[PDB]
Design a protein around this ligand. Structure first.
Ligand SMILES: *[C@@H](CC(=O)OCC)[C@H](C[C@@H]1CCNC1=O)NC(=O)[C@H](Cc1ccccc1)NC(=O)[C@@H](NC(=O)OCC1c2ccccc2-c2ccccc21)[C@@H](C)OC(C)(C)C
Ligand SMILES: *[C@@H](CC(=O)OCC)[C@H](C[C@@H]1CCNC1=O)NC(=O)[C@H](Cc1ccccc1)NC(=O)[C@@H](NC(=O)OCC1c2ccccc2-c2ccccc21)[C@@H](C)OC(C)(C)C
Lengths: 181, 181
């Protein structure tokens, strides 16, 4: 798991931030150019707090599948000059299952924390907070509030973003290459 | 830092537990035989909760130096049949400074979490919660309540146990080989 931690630490350092919306505090992962991702339930407005700074949101897309089923991801285009390091190469084309993953959080409640969550399984459909949701990845860890936007990784792979939990399992939305063109 | 995470994960799995005393919830590291360590301020009584179990404490020693100066460590002898894996080989004879360390926590507030804290420096004397305290190791991380008993490690080294913080820095008491005979 050493390499999985090592990759995760470098990825959070280069591409992650702490974001506040009206709906809470989240980890945010920048993907390429000025595009980043949040759990859909963060419900970013015209403005967000990004590491304490008011940042303008030029575009936001709540992702759904071809049937309109919720995927629980919102892509957002940031009004800022810096671009993110392009990490689309680390995103799979389809849901990845691994035996050992690391979930990385960066919030006030959990600043620079890394959790080895064990096996990730393609969970599939989940009734999440009452909304039918697809392309969930599941891991047996007691995830809690303050961990949404959590980045789920293994060595050289970004698997998904943490979006919910039932007190005993956690769930990430799979972060697929085609979401980013 | 990969190897430092890898060592830390294996060490917590084999030798750590979650302990409640009247004074809070702590990470506890077992050292050898039935001997473990807590921050002195956990103030373990005749009985502690060890992973939800009432466990008897046969002996407890609050460590002080040759002048009687506080070291902020309490060694405790547990009344249980299992012995800990002997990890005295990973303890230094004197305070270790490293460039990259991992602090590992295992509580309800922070179950199986690992934090890369950066450089550890021999801090020396510290007025901790009003008590003169020696042999502190310092790292620049915003440590919080719920992280005491936190185990500070680098590759193949157990450096100390987290005992306090000022909101911007954290401090571990050095865990020295001679404390354990
Ligand atoms: C992240 C928010 C954050 O960072 O805080 C800002 C400061 C947070 C993390 C999760 C909370 C608890 N565990 C976590 O990991 N995510 C949420 O709170 C998320 C919000 C949300 C998502 C989508 C729409 C609207 C809001 N909500 C939940 O995670 C949700 N849990 C849930 O839906 O559980 C699924 C269950 C399920 C599916 C199918 C069949 C049966 C069941 C079932 C049975 C019994 C319990 C759960 C489930 C919240 C609202 O939690 C409960 C469990 C109360 C529903
Ligand atoms: C661990 C407890 C835990 O797991 O909770 C159970 C559920 C906790 C972690 C630390 C809290 C905040 N940051 C942490 O990492 N440890 C303590 O609370 C610890 C308890 C204690 C230790 C020893 C005797 C009695 C109680 N207390 C503190 O960490 C303490 N901080 C402190 O003393 O700071 C040192 C400062 C210092 C030294 C020399 C010169 C000047 C200063 C200075 C100036 C200004 C601020 C701090 C210091 C607590 C009580 O915090 C404050 C900062 C309020 C004193």
């Amino acid at each position: 798991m050493g390499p999985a931690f090592e990759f995760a630490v470098a990825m959070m350092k280069r591409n992650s931030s702490t974001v506040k919306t009206e709906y809470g505090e989240f980890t945010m992962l920048g993907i390429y150019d000025r595009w980043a991702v949040l759990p859909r339930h963060a419900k970013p407005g015209p403005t967000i707090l990004m590491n304490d700074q008011e940042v303008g949101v030029l575009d936001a897309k709540e992702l759904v599948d071809k049937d309109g089923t919720n995927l629980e991801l919102t892509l957002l285009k940031l009004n800022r000059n810096e671009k993110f390091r392009d990490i689309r190469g680390f995103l799979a084309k389809e849901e990845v299952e691994v035996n050992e993953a690391v979930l990385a959080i960066n919030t006030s409640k959990f600043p620079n924390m890394y959790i080895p969550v064990g096996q990730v399984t393609e969970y599939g459909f989940l009734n999440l907070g009452g909304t039918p949701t697809k392309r969930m990845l599941m891991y047996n860890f007691p995830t809690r509030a303050g961990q949404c936007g959590g980045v789920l990784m293994s060595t050289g792979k970004v698997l998904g973003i943490h979006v919910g939990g039932n007190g005993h399992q956690g769930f990430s939305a799979a972060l697929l290459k085609h979401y980013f063109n």
